[PDB]
Amino acid sequence: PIELLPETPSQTAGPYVHIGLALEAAGNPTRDQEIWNRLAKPDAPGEHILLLGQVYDGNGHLVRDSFLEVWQADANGEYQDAYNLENAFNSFGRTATTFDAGEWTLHTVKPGVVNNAAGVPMAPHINISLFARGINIHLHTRLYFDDEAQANAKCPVLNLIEQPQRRETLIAKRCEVDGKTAYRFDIRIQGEGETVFFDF
Amino acid sequence: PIELLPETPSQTAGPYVHIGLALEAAGNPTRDQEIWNRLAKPDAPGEHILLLGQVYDGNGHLVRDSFLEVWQADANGEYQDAYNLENAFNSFGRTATTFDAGEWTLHTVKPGVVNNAAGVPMAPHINISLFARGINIHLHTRLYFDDEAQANAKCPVLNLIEQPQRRETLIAKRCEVDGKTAYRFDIRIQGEGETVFFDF
Amino acid sequence: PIELLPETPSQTAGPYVHIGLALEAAGNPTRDQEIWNRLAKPDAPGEHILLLGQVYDGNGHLVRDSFLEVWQADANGEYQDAYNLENAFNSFGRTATTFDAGEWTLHTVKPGVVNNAAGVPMAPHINISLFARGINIHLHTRLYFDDEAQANAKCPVLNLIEQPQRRETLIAKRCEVDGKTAYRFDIRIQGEGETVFFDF
Amino acid sequence: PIELLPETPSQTAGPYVHIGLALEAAGNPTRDQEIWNRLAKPDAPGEHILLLGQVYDGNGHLVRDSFLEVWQADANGEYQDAYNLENAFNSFGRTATTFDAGEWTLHTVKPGVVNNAAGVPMAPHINISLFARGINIHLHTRLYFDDEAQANAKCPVLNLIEQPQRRETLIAKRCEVDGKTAYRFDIRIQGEGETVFFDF
Amino acid sequence: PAQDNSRFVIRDRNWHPKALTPDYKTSIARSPRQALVSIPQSISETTGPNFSHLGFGAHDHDLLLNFNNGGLPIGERIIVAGRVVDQYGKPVPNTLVEMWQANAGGRERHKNDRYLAPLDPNFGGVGRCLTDSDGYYSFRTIKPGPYPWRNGPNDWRPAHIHFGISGPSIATKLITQLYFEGDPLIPMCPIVKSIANPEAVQQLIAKLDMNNANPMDCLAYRFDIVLRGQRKTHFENC
Amino acid sequence: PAQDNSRFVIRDRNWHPKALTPDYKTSIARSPRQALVSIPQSISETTGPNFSHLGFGAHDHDLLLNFNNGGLPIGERIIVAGRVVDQYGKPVPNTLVEMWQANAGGRERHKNDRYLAPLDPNFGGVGRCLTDSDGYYSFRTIKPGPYPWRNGPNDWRPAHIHFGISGPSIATKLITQLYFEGDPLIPMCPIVKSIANPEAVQQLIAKLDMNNANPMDCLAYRFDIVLRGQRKTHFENC
Amino acid sequence: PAQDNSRFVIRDRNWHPKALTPDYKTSIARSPRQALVSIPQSISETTGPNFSHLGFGAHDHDLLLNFNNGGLPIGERIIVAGRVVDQYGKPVPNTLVEMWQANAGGRERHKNDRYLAPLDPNFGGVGRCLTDSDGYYSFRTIKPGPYPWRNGPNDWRPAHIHFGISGPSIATKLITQLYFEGDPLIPMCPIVKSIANPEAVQQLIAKLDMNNANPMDCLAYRFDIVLRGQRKTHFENC
Ligand SMILES: [Fe+3]
Ligand SMILES: [Fe+3]
Ligand SMILES: [Fe+3]
Ligand SMILES: [Fe+3]
């Protein structure tokens, strides 16, 4: 058959990924420009929301060195690819859980609807890539919203998961932290309640 | 040592097993003679009983594409091998669980006692072979009855299972389906309460 | 793919084939029973005919050491396979051209119609196998009759030859030798007028 | 020495060439634009001429499944390469002989003179490429005209053919088809009067 | 009735595919975590049904004609024949051989297959046949086409025909899959890779058989099946 | 107009099949007995048509849709793509690639094919395409099936697609046949055996290309074509 | 905004390390037990960030100068350079390369690092760079040292540099480790042995590059990274 050049294989981000990728969360000095957890400036268009979660290993214990990267459409369903700290909204962001902060946080806006390649609308989501020591190749997952029950029911992506109980692990539960709208989204790498992880 | 020709290797029966082995179940037209789930005709001697069960995977989910073949002695303890749709009793039969029907059923008569090779009597049992998508080589198991507790406690097969709690996974529970005597035999492929499976 | 045992390869019958296969035509003493050129005794059923021909090489010169074997149905279209010199008709016969006799002869009956494997009638024919020095593997051909123009037109065998001019090389021309019906059939191994040869 | 990548090898065009290259001829529906046998439109400059011929195999039989492509200069001696169905003249065209039509025809204008690489003028000619079942790699030939005897006698191509009698096989005979000026160009693939074929 | 007079050679569980073969994804939740418990052979495991008296329809083994709604199926016409023997080389007569497959484009005739290759109105996809006195069986059908499935993101099952063989007892019964000689999808399919030894894979590859082909009509493949060997008991219980 | 400014590398007549290859029977009466006469290249041999302005219909390269009478063709859905380059590795842009083939059962849509595999009412068997600026072409179609023919008594053409390529001149034009990786009929076909060197045979075998496949939809094969190299003239006539 | 015009070649999950590699102890509790769910590529997976307007500091690629508290780091001065191409061999321009590493004695500048080799007061350990039009990136740094870790009782990581590369989409993002040619610790590390195929291990190894070294100054290593092949969509939704 036809063989192309092989992709460079993956390796674990290791324990101190933060020193290279989350300068602040590592407690080291930062540079002038850093890629971080604040996707939307306060005046950007859309419903502003706070996102939070913990990450668990297979024995129920908290993963405190994980690193996460997010990609989402803005409030009109458009991916903003030109990353610039001046922009009111970037579609890309990074966050982390640390020894001090067992919980990660992201400040963005609720994404709008995008279509899959056959033109069917997908429910609003957030693409998440998870890296950490012990994870040899990163885990891709998607964060959906409990208050978008109707569109979640028809998402052609959520529908590819055979078992109805497993689609619930991708649904983030609405709450309020200081009069501000927040969704909680915990990730269980392994075991009871294992979050669904994708391949593409 | 002496090496004979190797056995052809087993491959999974696949999601569409119903098309070649359970025609009606695949919802396709049947031929004149089909091997199905009515081992006993209304006038066959012995005690008429309805069997049913559900098949679970290791996440606790129903297997709705499984296929089962059974082999049992008649009411007097004899294996009827010449299969014929006109016989009153055939010792063999097939059944299946489908999307429609999550449960399989089999209409037969409670088997009489047969001896092992060593002349020792076995408790009354039904030989079962389970096939499906995801199973690479079929699983063998035995269905025994909860109301035959004296013979079960002495069966030389049930006593080869070391732990007592594992013997119970093979003992079908007497109940009533439409007012008719029935034994429910649920199979758990993996996990908590995993059904004992044999090699012979 | 599947390979069977290979067939023993052919070799030429060589120059003196007659000593092993045409004792008389070699001028050697014969045995009590010989396979020869007289297929029909005078009282056998059917139109008795005399067959004759010469055989030519690629330079127009006569082949004088050829050996020939014939197989044909009797007058009702039936192959008589039980060879016996007592029978009034044998379907098998052998003849030859020699240094003395440049011409071969056969005494038989006009064969009747047989069907091909799809049940379509074939025109009356005679199957001929030709051997000689210089011929590495024998040549199969068929002798048809000029007076069976209608059935020759529909023979599914003669129709497989693409070119109308080449089917004429398989047609034997009626004549009379001593008040007896005879068909002449010359065979040109190579060149102008090359006789058609088959493979099956 | 230096070896470049090898050319893909040629394979015969096959008996059904008409299906991909001569749609009408295969008797199949045509697309909007087809490359066919009318190189000149009624108003193209030069002398309008009809070409026709038959193709023979080495037994003297017609080839009724041949396909021909032609390339010729226009009346002023220029090769028109931009092919377009609206042009008045296209220098390229295709035609074919079929079971129906044993003869091919081509409607064009008599080509003007072109020079070889050495600045020497060639006689007026049509470049022909012949394809069919049985031909493993296509045959190149040149059609010249019998009424251009002075230019033919000096053509530096026709003079590379050593024997004079072989030069004549390339010279199409002026005749009249429906009262219209025509040149008949029969091709003999093999045998007596075999047409000269070139390699370049 | 059936009587206990045979023993069958124990299965080599390292030759057959294992239960847990994670590249085949559905096997992860459908494989037992506890060990199989070994039990001696008795009359329950050494006898099995016999299908001599089952009423076969006349085109049961002929898939070019057994479904038929007004024509012939579109696809490579083939005969698939072979012999069923045991591990001693002894033929297995009067046994039941079942088979089912996709059509030429890879679509299977079942409600749940949503693959975009169309259904063929003259093709069903099912056959049965009883082996003969020498263990031969034979079916005629069209060659199936490969199809994609939801395993990895670009997985494609090589062309295959599912086979099921009863043999003389429940101990011998087997469901397997035939593949076709030369198919470049065979070494990349995770289901075929569930068989760890490359030599066991070769046993499922049917070979082109020009000798059994009907000229101007259909090719043929040969597929021989080998069931567990059978022996008489000897020195048992003394 | 076209101008004589290129030379093409002379054809290796021992790499291409010879004219007389007696196992291919029809070639016996259709092959010349006299030698080919060699002639220098001039403007007549080094120029050729250009097909940029030909009016292609929108589905000319898409055989799953270009014939269409109410559905889709039955058969293995495939993309056949590749690149056309010259012997120097230089791409050949805006060139004409034509192709035609049998259907899935091996029947070809022409009056004279009397083979018993049926016609597919949604399939035509023809495509054309112009290469792109980098020399790529691509067609979508179903995989053809093999068919028997009247050569030897049990000869069968391996699955194939006929291709025709114009290139920049009549000197480069070529008609050939694509075969599919792994087909066990390839080494027994007398037409393929007309090519004497085994290395030239490999050049006609399209390879399975999982990288270009559309997941859950169609496989792909890659088939690269190499035309005669082209060079500028140098030191000619002084 | 970003448009859905590409498709990426599916990843080979037998080439990359599996999730469960028990000798690397931390992978046991941090590897999913359910099969990954395959999904088609949509605009969510085929686009990603472009970091062209990120404001880079002038020494962000130069580890000998970007931390700096009085002088130079102690250790072997080296240039690590290479190119980023996709599996079709096409440069990936303007992409983000980030890297981080230990100091010359294997100590990392992080609070939880308690290995007893001292910190280097002039070394921070972090760089970023954007590949150029041709896919080239370069860093200047000191070769790191190996260090021990609590895995097995005497496990030591070979000297290595971590890499994170963005590529054109989130489908191509990859984090890996670079290793140095000849380090005898490479075949003994359980993290490197998470890669089952030895030819995949080889791709992680930077080769000494004396052509790029600066004489009398620093050595150079070359490490080329290959991201998933990218192609235009063809024949989708018909
Ligand atoms: Fe590290
Ligand atoms: Fe299947
Ligand atoms: Fe001799
Ligand atoms: Fe063909």
Residues of chain F neighbouring D125 (CB-CB closer than 8 A): 44
Q: Which of residues 181-200 of E touch A (CB under 8 A)?
A: 184, 188
CB-based contact (8 Å) between F58 and chain D? Answer: no
Q: Give A98 Cα–ligand 2 centroid separation in angstroms.
A: 48
- Look up residue F72 and give its DSSP letter: P
Centre of ligand 2 to C-alpha E149, Å, is 10
Which chain E residue has the Cα nearest residue B66? E30
Largest CA distance in chain G: 65
What is the SS3 assignment for E119? coil
Interface residue F36 vs chain E (CB under 8 A):
no
Q: What is the 3-state secondary structure (H, E, C) of chain G?
A: CCCCCEEECCCCCCCCCCCCCCCCHHHCCCCCCCCCEECCCCHHHHCCCECCCCCCCCCCCECCCCCCCCCCCCCCEEEEEEEEEECCCCECCCCEEEEEECCCCCCCCCCCCCCCCCCCCCCCCEEEEECCCCCEEEEEEECCCCEEECCCCCEEECCEEEEEECCCCCCCCEEEEEEECCCCCHHHCCCHHHCCCHHHHHCCEEEECCCCCECCCEEEEECCEEECCEEECCCCCC
Strands G174-180 and G205-208: parallel
Instruction: State the count of interchain CB pairs (< 8 A) between A and F.
Output: 13
Tell me the C-alpha distance between D173 and D171, whole Å: 7
- Contact check, Cβ <8 Å, A199/E184: no
- Is the CB of residue A109 less than 8 Å from the CB of residue A48? yes
Q: Are D8 and F203 in contact (CB under 8 A)?
A: yes
> For residue E183, what is the nearest residue in chain A, using CA coordinates?
A1
Across the interface, of D20, D99, D190, the residue whose CB is closest to F164 is D20
CATH number assigned to the domain comprising residue F64: 2.60.130.10
From CA A33, how far away is CA A20, in angstroms rounded?
A: 14
Side-chain half-sphere CA neighbours of D81 within 13 A? 19
- G154: Cβ contacts below 8 Å, ≥ 6 apart: G148
Q: How far is CA D104 from the centre of its chain?
A: 10
F-chain residues near C197 (CB < 8 A): none
Q: Does D59 touch chain C (CB under 8 A)?
A: yes
With CA atoms as reference, the chain C residue closest to F154 would be C200
Rounded CA-CA distance B51/B97 in Å is: 13
E214 lies within 8 A of chain C by CB: no
**CB nearest G231 (choices: F65, F210, F212):** F212
Strand partners, G128: G98
Residue E27 gets which letter from DSSP?
Answer: G
Q: Which of F64, F69, F74, F214 to mutate to test the interface with E (most CBs of E within 10 A)?
A: F74
* H or E, element range at B164: helix B164-167
Which residues in chain B have Cβ-Cβ distances shorter than 8 Å to E11? 7, 199
Interface of E with G in 134-153 (CB under 8 A): 150-153
Give one DSSP letter per residue of chain A, joined into a string.
Answer: ----PPPPPP----TTHHHHH-TTTTT-PPPSS---SB-B-TTSSS-EEEEEE-EE-TTS-B--S-EEEEE---TTS----B--TTSSB-SEEEEE--SS-SSEEEEEE----EE-TTSPEEPS-EEEEEE-TT-SSPEEEEEEETT-HHHHHT-TTGGGSS-HHHHGGGEEEEEEETTEEEEE--EE-SSTTPPP-EE-
Structure tokens at A11: 């390796």
Chain E, window 25-54: residues with a beta carbon less than 8 angstroms from a chain B beta carbon: 26-34, 36-45, 47-54
- Is D174 among the annotated ligand-binding positions? no
Give the Cα separation of E62 and B108 in Å (integer): 33
CB under 8 Å to B21, separation ≥6 — which residues?
Answer: B13, B67, B94, B96, E98, E100, E164
C195, F23, G8 from C58: Cα distances, Å: 11, 21, 67
Backbone angles phi, psi at G26, to 5 degrees: -55, -30
F160 CA to centre of ligand 4 in angstroms: 7
Q: How far apart are CA E221 and CA E180, in angstroms?
A: 8
Q: Is E155 on the interface with C (CB under 8 A)?
A: no
User: Contact E197/E72 with Cβ under 8 angstroms?
Assistant: no
Specify whether the CB–CB gap between F174 and D7 falls below 8 A. yes
Residue with tokens 């589905």: F59
Taking residue A17's Cβ as centre, other Cβ atoms within 10 Å add up to: 24
3-state secondary structure of D109: strand
CA torsion G231-A69-G24-A58 (nearest 10°) is -120
Please answer yes or no on whether F38 and D199 come within 8 Å at the CB atom. Answer: yes
CA distance F114 to chain G (A): 33
**Contact yes or no for C187/C129 (Cβ under 8 A):** no
Nearest CA in chain G to F137: G234
Please check whether residue F79 is in contact with residue F140, taking contact to mean a CB–CB distance below 8 angstroms: yes
Length of chain G: 238
In Å, what resolution does this model reach? 2.1
Query: Do G18 and A136 contact (CB within 8 A), yes or no?
Result: yes
Binding residues of C for 3,4-dihydroxybenzoate: 133
d(CA A192, CA B110): 40
Amino acid found at G127: G
Name every residue whose Cβ is closer than 8 Å to that of residue C5 and which is 6 or more positions away in sequence. none
- The amino acid occupying position A100 is D
Residue B134 Cα to ligand 2 middle (Å) = 12
Q: Give the closest residue to E127 by CA, choosing from E154, E153, E101.
A: E101
Close Cβ partners of B124 (under 8 Å, ≥ 6 residues apart): B110, B111, B112, B113, B144, B145, B148, B151
Distances (CA, A) of D46 to D42, D43, D76, G73: 10, 9, 8, 86
Per the CB < 8 A criterion, the answer to whether F173 and F48 are in contact is: yes
Q: Please give the structure tokens belonging to residue D103.
A: 């003869």
C107 CB-near residues (< 8 Å, 6+ apart): C37, C38, C39, C40, C48, C50, C51
Physical contact, A and C (3 or more Cβ pairs within 8 A): no
**Residue D105 exposure: Cα atoms within 13 Å on the Cβ side:** 12
Q: How far is CA E140 from the centre of its chain?
A: 15
Q: In whole angstroms, what is the distance from residue E83 CA to residue E96 CA?
A: 12
Tokens encoding F228: 């005669």
Least Cα distance to F160 among D11, D26, C148, E65 occurs for D11
Who contacts E117 (Cβ-Cβ below 8 Å, separation ≥6)? E103, E105, E106, E107, E145, E147, F72, F74, F75, F76, F77
Lookup: tokens for A86: 């001046």
CA of D25 to the centre of ligand 4 (A): 17
Residue B115 makes CB contacts below 8 A (sequence gap 6+) with B121, B122, E42, E43
Give chain A's largest Cα–Cα span.
Answer: 59
Rounded to 5°, angle at Cα E63 from E57 and E64: 115
Contact A24, A34 (CB under 8 A): yes
**CA pair distance D117, G156, nearest whole angstrom:** 74
Question: Are F222 and A4 within 8 A, CB to CB?
Answer: no
Long-range contacts of G68-72 (CB under 8 A, 24+ apart): G68/G122, G69/G121, G69/G122, G70/G121, G70/G122, G71/G122, G72/G122
How far CA D62 is from CA of A188, C91, D105, D187, F65, in Å, comes to 79, 40, 15, 10, 37
Is E201 in a helix, a strand, or coil?
A: helix
Nearest-Cα distance to chain F for D182, in Å, is: 22
Give the β-pairing of G6-8 and G230-232: antiparallel
Measure Cα distances from C20 to B57, C34, C64, D183, E1 in Å.
79, 11, 16, 63, 64
Dist. CA F207–CA F180, nearest whole Å? 7
Query: Which ligand approaches the C-alpha of residue C18 most closely?
Result: 3
G230: CB partners within 8 A, 6+ apart: G6, G7, G8, G9, G86, G88, G90, G168, G169, G172
> How many domains does chain E contain in total?
1
- Which one-letter DSSP state was computed for residue D62? B
What span, in angstroms and rounded, lies between the C-alpha atoms of E28 and E26?
5
Strand-strand pairing, F205-208 and F219-222: antiparallel
What residue in E sits closest to A2 (Cα-Cα)?
A: E184
- The DSSP secondary structure of D139-175, one letter per residue, reads EEEEEEETT-HHHHHH-TTGGGSSSHHHHGGGEEEEE
- Cα distance between residue G60 and residue G79, in whole Å: 14
CA distance F41 to D125: 15
What is the distance in angstroms between the CA of the first residue and the CA of the last residue of chain C?
21
Q: CA–CA separation, E114 vs E108, rounded Å?
A: 9
Count other Cβ atoms within 10 Å, centred on residue F229. Answer: 20
DSSP 8-state secondary structure symbol assigned to residue E56: -
User: Phi and psi of C17, rounded to 5°?
Assistant: -50, -35
CA distance G85 to chain F (A): 16
3-state secondary structure at position E204: coil
- Sign of the CA dihedral running A108, A111, A116, A119: negative
CB A127 within 8 A of CB A64: no
Do the beta carbons of residue E51 and residue B171 sit within 8 Å?
A: no
What the block records as the tokens of C69 is 């074997």
Homologous superfamily (CATH) of C1-200 is Aromatic compound dioxygenase (2.60.130.10)
Q: Are F224 and F81 in contact (CB under 8 A)?
A: no
Domain extent listing, chain D: 1-200
Q: Is G207 exposed, middle or buried (0-12, 13-18, 19+ CB in 10 A)?
A: middle
Render B76-131 in DSSP notation, one character per residue.
Answer: TS----B--TTSSB-SEEEEE--SS-SEEEEEEE-----B-TTSPBPPS-EEEEEE
Residue C25 burial class via C-beta count within 10 angstroms: exposed 0-12, middle 13-18, buried 19 and up: buried
Q: Using CA coordinates, name the residue in chain F closest to D66.
A: F30
| Cβ atoms of residues B196 and E37 within 8 Å | yes
Dihedral of alpha carbons E92, E93, E95, E101, sign: positive
Q: How far apart are the first and last CA of chain F?
A: 25
Find all residues with CB under 8 Å of B145, minimum gap 6, and list them: B110, B123, B124, B152, B171, B172, B174, B183
Ligand closest to CA F149: 4
Rounded to a whole number of angstroms, the distance from the CA of E149 to the nearest CA of chain G is: 10
Q: Per the structure block, which two tokens stand in for F9?
A: 């590398």
Per the CB < 8 A criterion, the answer to whether E67 and E134 are in contact is no
F74 three-state secondary structure:
coil
Opening angle at CA G77, ends G74 and G78, nearest 5? 145
C contacts of E181 (beta carbons < 8 Å): 1
Pairs from E16-20 (Cβ < 8 Å, separation ≥ 24): E16/B7, E16/B9, E16/B10, E16/B136, E16/B137, E16/E195, E16/E200, E17/B9, E17/B10, E17/B11, E17/B136, E17/B137, E17/E194, E17/E195, E17/E196, E18/B136, E18/E194, E18/E196, E19/B135, E19/B136, E19/B137
DSSP label of B163 = S
Q: How far from the centroid of its chain's Cα atoms is residue A81's Cα?
A: 16
CA distance D91 to G34: 67
CA distance linking residue B196 with residue B166, whole number of Å: 7
* B37 contacts B95 by C-beta, under 8 angstroms: yes
Tokens of residue B193, six digits: 């309460």
E82: Cα separation from own chain's centroid: 12
Spell out the long-range contacts of A142-147 with Cβ–Cβ below 8 A and sequence spacing 24 or more: A142/A170, A142/A198, A142/G44, A143/A51, A143/A170, A143/A172, A143/A183, A143/A185, A144/A170, A144/A171, A144/A172, A145/A110, A145/A171, A145/A172, A145/A174, A145/A183, A146/A171, A146/A172, A146/A173, A146/A174, A146/A183, A147/A174
User: CA A73 to CA G227: how far, in whole Å?
Assistant: 24
CA triplet D99, D104, D107: central angle to 5 degrees? 145
Cβ atoms within 10 Å, residue A48: 18
Closest by CA to E195, choosing from E206, E185, E187, is E187
Q: Which residues have C-beta under 5 Å from ligand 2, the single-atom ion?
A: B 14
Whole-number Cα distances in Å, E94 to A42, E97, E98 = 80, 9, 13
| Sign (positive or negative) of CA dihedral B53, B55, B58, B61 | negative
- Three-state DSSP state, E176: strand
The answer to whether E210 and C1 are in contact (CB under 8 A) is yes
